[PDB]
Symmetry: D2
Subunit: 186 residues, 4 copies
Amino acid sequence: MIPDDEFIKNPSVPGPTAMEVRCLIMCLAEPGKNDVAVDVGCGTGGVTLELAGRVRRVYAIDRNPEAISTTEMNLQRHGLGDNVTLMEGDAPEALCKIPDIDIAVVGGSGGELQEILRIIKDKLKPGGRIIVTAILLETKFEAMECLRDLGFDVNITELNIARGRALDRGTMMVSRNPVALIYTGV
Amino acid sequence: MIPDDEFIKNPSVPGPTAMEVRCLIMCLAEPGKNDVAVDVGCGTGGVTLELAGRVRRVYAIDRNPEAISTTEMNLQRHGLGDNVTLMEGDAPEALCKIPDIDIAVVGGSGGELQEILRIIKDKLKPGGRIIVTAILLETKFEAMECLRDLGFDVNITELNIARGRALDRGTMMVSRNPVALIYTGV
Amino acid sequence: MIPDDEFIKNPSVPGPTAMEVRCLIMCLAEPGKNDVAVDVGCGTGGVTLELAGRVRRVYAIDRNPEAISTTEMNLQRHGLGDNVTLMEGDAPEALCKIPDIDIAVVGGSGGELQEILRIIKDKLKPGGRIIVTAILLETKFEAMECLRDLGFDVNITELNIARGRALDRGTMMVSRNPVALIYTGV
Amino acid sequence: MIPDDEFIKNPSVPGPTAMEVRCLIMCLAEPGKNDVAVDVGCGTGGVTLELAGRVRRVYAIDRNPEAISTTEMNLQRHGLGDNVTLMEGDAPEALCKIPDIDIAVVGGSGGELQEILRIIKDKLKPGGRIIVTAILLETKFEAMECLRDLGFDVNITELNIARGRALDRGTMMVSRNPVALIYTGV
């Protein structure tokens, strides 16, 4: 999989999602070659890149123009993007213009999490999966609550990752901020 | 991916490796359909199962007969194993009888880690990858050291995973023991 | 400090709080010899024992009779308890019958967290401290929210602890479930 | 206890040790008012400050002059230091010039960990305690090994701490790098 260091970064754009998290998102999503996926809040394009090479169509959404731009660049550098529809603008509006989906990954909730999830529920193909990426303590709670209130069986996994950094004196373990994945049953 | 609960367990056999770890091993291994892989210390068969459905040939090794047996069962229950060669007996001896490999995953080091790694280095095809699973503090150190002394560029990632358990009162987070992955460059 | 293994346990009573957590609670509480403290949901008595030997008076509350019982026992085995008032029954009622407090530690929220916190706010002596122990994801959120809505400056710290277990083959790290401490400014 | 933010920091000097770690070091050390303690690799002075206000004498050692300097400053700002002997220079040499000790905390091993521990073993008063702070993977291993080879019963505890950071959108959990504490029996 593409490591964090091989991504094009931008100051106003957060990400990429740590590779270890992207790895788990892919496993929970269970991407099929005929699946249609949406990535709400694509940021640097980490999740978009991985999905792109595994499903039929990927719709990448973000309010931040810089994010659409960075995702666009990372897509090209790795020769993907032919099956990716980039969409700038407000998440709720953009989601209304999209076909039904098999996989929905919601990163930057952008405050409108509850609305985004309701909309996503109305477009979810049977057997579809929703995966919410949470950095804020409130998102972990809000996501769990919404998904349960929309009738899904909800689960949550928190990851704490430490990678070794080679120093002269030795290998020191460097932490990544904890990331929680709230996901609905398959 | 196959979740931990859908595996056939045995008392004298450890595992399965937590799904989140198996997920990362697969990502680091970058399994190609024409790759030959070896799984030293296959245990319950977690890694063997995942590799089986993605590479050309998998050689699963373990000293413990119960492990070969459990791996065998889990393979059957999921309709895999046609491309898996099970091998009971001492790791170093078994490795000498195997073709050259593209991917090597070393779980249960079984004390002979240093020797196993040397042997694996002599059979690694160019561009091959080695991934060592460490539970013991000594294995983390020893693996790092050996691989470096064998001339590889070594990395290490520690994972701390917590999964939510639905209780009546609410969702409590339950921890998994930390697991470290020591891996060589691609 | 008293280690987890030197506590008398009971089936229906959770605890003791991991020593590493009890250690941080004591540090955040800043127990003075003339302070009056309340321990809501005392469980096995871990926090009660530590406070007992450092403040003037400790009021230990729990609905579960077994818990009051276990706390009672652990208090005796360590020769403390002269300055501890045990109180069985519903937390909100019991809190109404107690003097004003300098330190309040709330363990087993027992569903009535919001009410317990309001009450505790009305009895808090100036410069007092509140520390909420959270195991459930909802308690972390609810505590943060209540305390903020009651006008306190709120903080949160999550601890993930692993202790080494000496095995014949080596030292394996064993995890404790994550525990969060939500506390108000001093 | 003194929070991380109330310390004077310096570029070339690492620390302060996270408060949650300092809290546990104090608990493992069990500082008595008549104890003599040594802090090898005092850095910003975190451990030195805490020990200062609890034992009879504290000998703070560090090769880095800037560290001695920073510790000196933090001591003053909190009105401590009357019972602290600062010592610049190479750890092994400095330790030879100190009285026997009750408590020894070794932070910045500075490569000479093995020698430092040997020396410390020869000056440890009966019932004395040694606590080694490890950031590097190699130190965790080396400390465990040395202390065992010097005849102590060794233990290890790894802490992963996350603190909440109030943002407008909510409270995001921010991680601290993992820290291991290797300590000998009391």
